Amino acid sequence: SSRPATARKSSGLSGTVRIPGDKSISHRSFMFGGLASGETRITGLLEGEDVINTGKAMQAMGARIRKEGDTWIIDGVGNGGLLAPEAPLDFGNAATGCRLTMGLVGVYDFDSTFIGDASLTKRPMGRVLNPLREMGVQVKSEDGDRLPVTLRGPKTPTPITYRVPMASAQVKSAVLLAGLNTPGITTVIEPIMTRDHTEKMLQGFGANLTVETDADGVRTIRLEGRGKLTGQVIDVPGDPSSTAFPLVAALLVPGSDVTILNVLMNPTRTGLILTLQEMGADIEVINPRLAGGEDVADLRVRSSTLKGVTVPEDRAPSMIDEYPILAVAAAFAEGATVMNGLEELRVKESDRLSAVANGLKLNGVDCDEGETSLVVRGRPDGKGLGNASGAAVATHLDHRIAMSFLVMGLVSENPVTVDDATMIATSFPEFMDLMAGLGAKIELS
Ligand SMILES: O=C(O)C1=C[C@@H](OP(=O)(O)O)[C@@H](O)[C@H](O)C1
Ligand SMILES: O=C(O)C[NH2+]CP(=O)(O)O
């Protein structure tokens, strides 16, 4: 069922910790490793529930996955080698695994069924099912193009040129993965850049995939279908979204000095850091380097006084999953923090705009929720914030609502309670232990 947790004011967070692996890259490591020819070896994999579900889906289609020591070793089936799954592919809470896998196997000439939990089952799949219909996939979905969904690919899929209508890396990725088993050239046009793990990793696995960027920023990504993919050695960098929790906690809790090691610094993932620096955050980027083909660095974070800023709609894609924690940081900043271009938040694990606004109000924060925006006015000393009565923030099965408000409780005058901590393990099973090690006091029911 549900397991509430309460965060209490901290006298200071301090230490050096390695953050768990990046979820996006981890999902793709299991997918590409499972599809490629030969062996793939992965170090640093995030072992949260979302990623484990993608792994089980790949095994269901023929890939052999095992963990030897600290390395996940995968024996892939080779491009075009996926086998028809016996039962529905259960993605639990993970749309990344669900949506990318719909593109990956939907173009195969067999039936595949997709299911998930109460949260995933309410999320929109039309954004990926429409391009798949264009490629010739037959779709059976619940009203509104929601799960459960059953796909049946054509004998010969049709390659398309698809302009992604919203800033979704998952839609871009689903079309590219469908292209892997489609003869001809699949093209995805992305008017606004989104995380590029699919492009980078597929190139690393040997795909004839190219990215061309116009001076106006529009990206044209071309993929030649049915080409060989070769298993690779993958070193997964630290998750920058997970990093956000101890990083923001250290900025807000007085007397803090926290260093997070091996953090992914791809700029499509660092909008929150840039925003916090604009707010006056003391975040030092240490030893920027190349590791596993990605940009990484260690981040030293110290207590800072913050001032509200206006965050432009075009930075949104580079920090879309960090709006919840940014809203909590804004609750302690001087003045108003204004964030627009937030329509995508309404279709995540929870409607995040509604969940964040409601959670902030329950904890005494002055904020204004708009259809696609949020304004937060802060109280730097934290006085009057939190909830003395112990009322619980509704998490709506969303791991980041749970984590963001638990961080808030380490700073506010009154404790902050979340109605459920059980979904935190979908992306950051180490959260409680990691925060406790730094000094945070979080009581699980
Ligand atoms: O492709 C990916 O790895 C992801 C893309 C994003 O979703 P959208 O494509 O829906 O924006 C992000 O929020 C999710 O956690 C992972
Ligand atoms: O991790 C996040 O904050 C949002 N996306 C989760 P997914 O789309 O994979 O379910």
DSSP code per residue over 409-435: HTTSSS-EEES--TTGGGT-TTHHHHH
Cα-Cα end-to-end distance for the chain: 12
Distance CA 199, CA 275 (A): 26
Distances from the Cα of 185 to the Cαs of 118, 155, 209, 309, in angstroms?
A: 37, 17, 10, 44
* Residues 80, 102 contacting (CB under 8 angstroms): no
Ligand located closest to 242 CA: 2
CA distance 130 to 145: 9
Q: Is 321 a catalytic residue?
A: yes
CATH code for the structural domain at 1-22+237-445: 3.65.10.10
Dist CA 143 CA 263 (whole Å): 40
Domain chopping of the chain, boundaries? 1-22+237-445, 23-236
Counting from 1 in the atom list of ligand 1, the atom nearest the Cα of 171 is 9
Cβ proximity of 142 and 132 under 8 Å: no
Is the fold of 1-22+237-445 the same as that of 23-236? yes
Contact criterion met (CB below 8 Å) for 391 and 232: no
Q: Residue 444: how many CA atoms within 13 Å on its side-chain side?
A: 11
Ligand 2 midpoint to CA 303 (Å): 28
Q: Cβ atoms within 10 A of the Cβ of 214, count?
A: 10
Strands (E), 228-346: 233-235, 257-264, 282-291, 294-302, 310-311, 336-340
d(CA 145, CA 102): 13
Asked whether the beta carbons of 169 and 162 are under 8 A apart, the reply is: no
Q: In this structure, which ligand is nearest to the CA of 173?
A: 1
CA-nearest residue for atom 3, ligand 1, is: 24
Nearest-angstrom CA–CA distance, 439 and 66: 35
Q: Extract the runs of DSSP E, i.e. beta strands, from 69-179.
A: 71-75, 89-90, 111-115, 138-142, 146-152, 161-163
Distance 176 CA to ligand 1 centre (A): 15
Amino acid found at 157: P
Backbone angles phi, psi at 66, to 5 degrees: -155, 160
Using most ligand atoms within 8 A of CB, pick from 119, 241, 320 the residue to mutate for ligand 1: 320
> Closest ligand 2 atom to the C-alpha of 399?
3
CB 26 within 8 A of CB 96: no
With 0-12 CB in 10 A as exposed, 13-18 as middle and 19+ as buried, what is 121? middle
* Strand arrangement of the beta sheet that strand 39-43 belongs to: 64-68, 71-75, 39-43, 233-235
Catalytic residue among 90, 235, 298, 321: 321
Residue 108 phi/psi, 5° resolution?
A: -90, 150
Query: SS3 for 93?
Result: coil
Specify the residue with its C-alpha closest to ligand 2, atom 5: 348
- Token pair in block for residue 383: 């006085």
The reply to whether ligand 2 has any atom less than 6 angstroms from the CB of 294 is: no
Q: Return the structure tokens found at 322.
A: 């960090």
CATH number of the 23-236 domain: 3.65.10.10
Going by the DSSP 8-state scheme, the letter that residue 236 receives in this structure is P
Phi, psi of 388 (to 5 degrees): -60, -30
Interval between CA 206 and ligand 2 midpoint (Å):
27
* Beta carbons of 429 and 19 less than 8 angstroms apart: no
In a 3-state reduction of DSSP, which class is residue 110?
coil
For residues 409 and 365, the answer to whether their CB atoms sit within 8 Å is no
Other beta carbons within 10 angstroms of residue 410's beta carbon come to: 30
Query: What gap in Å lies between CA 95 and CA 116, rounded to an integer?
Result: 9
Q: Which of 243, 345, 349 to mutate for ligand 2's pocket (most ligand atoms within 8 Å of CB)? A: 349
CA distance 219 to 163: 10
- What does the alpha-carbon distance between residue 128 and residue 193 come to, in Å, rounded to a whole number? 18
Q: Rounded distance, CA 14 to CA 132, Å? A: 49
CA distance 400 to 93: 13
Q: Which ligand is nearest to the CA of 48?
A: 2
**Is residue 357 within 8 Å of 401, Cβ to Cβ?**
no
Q: Tell whether residue 377 is among the known ligand binding residues.
A: no
The DSSP H or E segment spanning 60 is: helix 49-60
Ligand 2 site, residue 94, Cβ cutoff 6 A: yes
- Integer-rounded Cα Rg, in Å, for the chain is 21
CB contact set of 151 (below 8 Å; sequence gap of 6+): 102, 105, 106, 111, 112, 113, 114, 132, 137, 138, 139, 140
Task: Please give the distance, rounded to the nearest whole angstrom, from the Cα atom of residue 265 to the centre of ligand 2.
Answer: 19
